[PDB]
């Protein structure tokens, strides 16, 4: 996260760190949507151009973390995965459309002050909140800037949603119905953004009606750090909710 700041403890208790068993390393962000299910980006699991082809026995999720590196005993929960489900219409060969995956925990994770699930959006929350100029919050442990640098604790940033035509016109890459963009404009005195290590983490909005946090997006292609892009691209979670509910119902 670029131009973010240190998370207050428990600020996003749904934040999950996708973590490699061997070597032990941060791979991506992720989010807790129930005591058994974790949401991430598909390209965090399967992306052969970056030599990523992970199976369930390659991976851990670390839940309840604040420090990027410390073993946070008695606060974090480190979990193996039972199964990974990648969206059937995700195709890394073409583009990052439907960049979404579900991770089923081996066991339900116990909730605490530091571990609690985020809400999934419904149609109303999209229509009322997913609007140009409205800000959502992105969290992660990705790099702080270009390498050509890592935070000690989870970073927080608030980002404005970009008008769909404006984002379509900012790039020659196709912005599908399953994506939205977020990020500041060139004349803004804020420059927040997500970087690759933030991929798979949540873009979350606090409802002005009920004080609940709703995960509207998944970081799919941030523009910060080494990408030096214009706007960050996010998986539109609601547009893929049919698949999400299908998997949970079938395999929960």
């Amino acid at each position: 996260i670029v131009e973010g700041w240190d998370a207050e403890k428990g600020i996003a208790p749904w934040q999950v760190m996708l973590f490699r068993k061997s070597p032990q390393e941060l791979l991506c962000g992720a989010s807790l949507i129930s005591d058994r299910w974790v949401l991430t980006a598909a390209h965090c699991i399967l992306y052969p151009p970056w030599d990523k082809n992970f199976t369930e026995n390659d991976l851990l999720v670390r839940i309840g973390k604040h420090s990027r590196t410390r073993y946070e005993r008695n606060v974090e929960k480190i979990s193996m995965l039972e199964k990974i489900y990648v969206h059937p219409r995700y195709n890394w060969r073409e583009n990052l459309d439907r960049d979404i995956a579900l991770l089923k925990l081996k066991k339900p994770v116990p909730f605490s002050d530091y571990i609690h699930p985020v809400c999934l959006p419904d149609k109303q929350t999209v229509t009322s909140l997913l609007r140009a100029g409205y800000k959502g919050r992105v969290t992660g442990w990705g790099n702080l800037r270009e390498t050509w640098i890592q935070p000690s604790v989870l970073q927080v940033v608030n980002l404005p949603i970009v008008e769909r035509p404006v984002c379509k016109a900012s790039t020659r890459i196709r912005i599908t119905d399953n994506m939205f963009c977020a990020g500041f404009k060139v004349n803004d005195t804020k420059r927040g953004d997500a970087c690759e290590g933030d991929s798979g983490g949540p873009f979350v909005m606090k409802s002005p009606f009920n004080n609940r946090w709703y995960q509207m997006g998944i970081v799919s292609a941030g523009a910060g750090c080494d990408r030096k892009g214009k706007y960050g691209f996010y998986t539109h979670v609601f547009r893929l909710k049919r698949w999400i509910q299908k998997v949970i119902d079938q395999f929960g």
Binding site: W5, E8, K9, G10, I11, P13, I33, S34, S112, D113, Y114, H116, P117, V118, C119, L120, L129, R131, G133, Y134, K135, G136, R137, V156, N158, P160, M205, K206, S207, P208, N211, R212, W213, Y214
Partner: peptide, 30 residues
């Protein structure tokens, strides 16, 4: 489920975090 999106250390304790006001203030349309 019914508990989703409410933070034990914030919403459940009637506390606010340092920047959630920025988010609220961004809701300006109508």
């Amino acid at each position: 489920e019914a508990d989703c999106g409410l933070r034990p250390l914030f919403e459940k304790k009637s506390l606010k975090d340092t920047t959630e006001k920025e988010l609220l203030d961004s809701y300006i349309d109508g």
